[PDB]
Design a protein around this nucleic acid. Sequence first.
DNA 1: ATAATGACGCT
DNA 2: AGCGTCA
Length: 430
Amino acid sequence: GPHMATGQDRVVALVDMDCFFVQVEQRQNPHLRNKPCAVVQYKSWKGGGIIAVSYEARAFGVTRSMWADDAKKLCPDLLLAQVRESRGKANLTKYREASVEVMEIMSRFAVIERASIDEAYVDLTSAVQERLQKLQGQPISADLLPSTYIEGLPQGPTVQKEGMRKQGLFQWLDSLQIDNLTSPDLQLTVGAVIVEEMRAAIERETGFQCSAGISHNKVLAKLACGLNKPNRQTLVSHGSVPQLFSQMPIRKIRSLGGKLGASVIEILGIEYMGELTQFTESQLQSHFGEKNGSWLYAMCRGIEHDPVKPRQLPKTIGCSKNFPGKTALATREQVQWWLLQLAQELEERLTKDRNDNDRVATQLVVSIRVQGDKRLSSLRRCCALTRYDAHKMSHDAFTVIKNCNTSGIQTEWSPPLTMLFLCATKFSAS
DNA sequence: ATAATGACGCT
DNA sequence: AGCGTCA
Ligand SMILES: Cc1cn([C@H]2C[C@H](O)[C@@H](COP(=O)(O)NP(=O)(O)OP(=O)(O)O)O2)c(=O)[nH]c1=O
Ligand SMILES: [Mg+2]
Ligand SMILES: [Mg+2]
């Protein structure tokens, strides 16, 4: 009753760019706008691998990870933009720079946590408090929420989707108690007004469209964001959670899309997130451990405490290249040349980082994958990063891995290497 | 033969 | 430190 926490203490948003790398290429090349379009890396093998897809192309069934030659079979008029290639590898600089454009705009509104190249969580609790003060006790007009969906509405006693959107919004606003500055539903609504403003600013200042979720925590905000992509935002209230979760597959919830989510399903014999409510916290802890158990117990009730961390910048700077199949590296000279290519890209990015962000990386992590091993990494080794010098970094990287080579002939490398990865870590102020 | 990344938990 | 998970 009066002591049961409801997880309604915060207003959190997740803003995610729509088909992000595609929009970056469409801004640059007007010929690609409003067309079925995809971004591809590496053209020679099967036309390249697709890493981003416009919504027009998605309607033909084009997806990420598809080969471009195959995507063209589904969508003969598909247009393609290629990722820049530098020093023999994909170079993602253009998309990193476009990411900064969007992150810097979001940071004007609130503390953000960069969660990927194209999304950030936003803690709007404070911003909402102040806007509520400015807004007297004035009603909130539907005109202030022109792209907002209220999940779960309309309900009760129109055949167009915009008609549906409005009806639900009307029911929501009609029910809202504006006199109470402490109403969680009110707080979420004001949060959504602010996110409309944020999303308009992003589009005005960059040309990029995005979607967003507004709820009381990160997991619900992220889930909400995806419910009405593209170019729309969704409010998921605490009250909407039982119905929303009642048919929500467990794998759709952030962090449950992998092996843990699968074991939840297998061990407990359930399918939907809401079904988790029937287990005691101790029961969930017994199956999945203390941390996962407690997290699941609260999360299936719509409650989560993970804070929006104040971090706009990546914690690591890395670059990697795979060498699949026949191309696996099999000579020492091959290994050294590619370590040099990676180290050169790293130096350039690190030097830029140091100038922009007043920090220096102090540790170098070297990772390789060996032929036959289907793990991401077969081996990780680290050394000190004391100089932003590509030749030193590549030399040092070789030094810490060179003993992996089981070959008798030292000019040869065995087993062949299917991946090289250099990562600069442990930043300190500079 | 998707690739290229990036955060974080466990021991 | 080095490995595993999730995205
Ligand atoms: C998931 C994923 C994304 N990306 C890149 C391309 C995407 O445009 C960008 C953002 O990822 P996303 O938000 O998961 N997908 P999207 O922004 O292209 O499309 P939407 O968010 O579903 O509208 O990151 C990859 O390069 N490999 C990946 O596995
Ligand atoms: Mg996106
Ligand atoms: Mg994203």
